[PDB]
Amino acid sequence: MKLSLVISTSDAAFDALAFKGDLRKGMELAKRVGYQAVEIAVRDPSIVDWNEVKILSEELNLPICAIGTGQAYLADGLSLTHPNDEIRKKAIERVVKHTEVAGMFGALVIIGLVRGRREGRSYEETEELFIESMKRLLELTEHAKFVIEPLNRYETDFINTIDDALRILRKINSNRVGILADTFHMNIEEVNIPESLKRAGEKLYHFHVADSNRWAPGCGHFDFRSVFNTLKEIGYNRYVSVECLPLPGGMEEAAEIAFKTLKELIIKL
């Protein structure tokens, strides 16, 4: 298992200097604390100079392990299940641009809020539309790997549990799509988290950690011990990525506390 840090970055459209500054500050923090990779989130990759990002990654010996896409939904309204097929097509085209960046870094592409919500429709129709969009994404890409993140009920009514996502993976039937499980979301939505992770098994491709209050792991009441016992049991050997609020004490303090909590869980494995 490896440790990664999710870094917040300003959008670059807008403010190129702020994006670059945020990115460097976050990557230097991750490296100093001891993280082995970083994870980022960008709304539209077409407005970023990825050649400079690559140089930064090389300078710091810090890979980018995953790229989040949710701002494409929250800011730009793009959804892979949008009832308007024109917007569905634009969402697919946006995510293809994320996969072009991911290919430079060997990064996973996260399918979170960009999948969209039920919007008054049956779960069945929403799921069918989503599977069609994902199959299109697989037809459009040769190397990209995607991970579906179940999110809690307040963020979406479409794919709330690991089981929801596993059903969809069976229909998509591609090893280029897996699951991203997130402890903050699972703390609400999963009955028994160790059992849920066992059901995921080999399909667990990426992992987000934050405590019950979404603070740094260690600063709420989430049982990480049972989770890491299970991760060892299912042979999970990919990234554990810290995706938490900058609490307590700011982004640097949170990243350090999280690292210490997780390192102790992992070394006693």
Of 149, 202, 233, 252, the active-site residue reads 149
What sign does the dihedral 113-136-240-232 (CA atoms) show?
positive
Provide the b/e sequence for 225-234 (b: ≥16 CB within 10 Å): eebbebbeeb
Cβ neighbours around 157 below 10 Å, total: 15
- 52 a catalytic residue: no
Q: At what angle do helices 162-172 and 123-140 cross, to 10 degrees?
A: 50
Candidate ranges 51-59, 71-79, 160-168, 181-189; the one touching Co ion (CB under 5 A): 181-189
Q: Residue 181, SS3? A: strand
Note whether 33 and 259 are within 8 A (CB): yes
Residue 51 found at the interface with its own copies (CB under 8 A): no
Out of 100, 125, 195, 233, the only residue in the binding site for its own copies (CB under 8 A) is 100
Q: What is the DSSP string of 209-228?
A: E--TTSSSTTSS---HHHHH
Which CB atom, from 127 or from 182, has the smaller least distance to Co ion?
Answer: 182
Residue 15 found at the interface with its own copies (CB under 8 A): no
What part of residues 225-264 is at the interface with its own copies (CB under 8 A)?
234-238
Q: Is 243 annotated as a binding residue?
A: yes
Q: Is 221 annotated as a binding residue?
A: no
Q: How far is the CB of 24 from its own copies (least distance, A)?
A: 26
- 149 a catalytic residue: yes
Residue 208 found at the interface with Co ion (CB under 5 A): yes
Q: How far apart are CA 50 and CA 105, in angstroms?
A: 10
Which CB atom, from 21 or from 235, has the smaller least distance to its own copies?
Answer: 235
Residues that bind its own copies (CB under 8 A): 89, 93, 96-97, 100, 103, 138-139, 142-143, 175, 202, 234-238
Enzyme catalytic residues: 149, 243
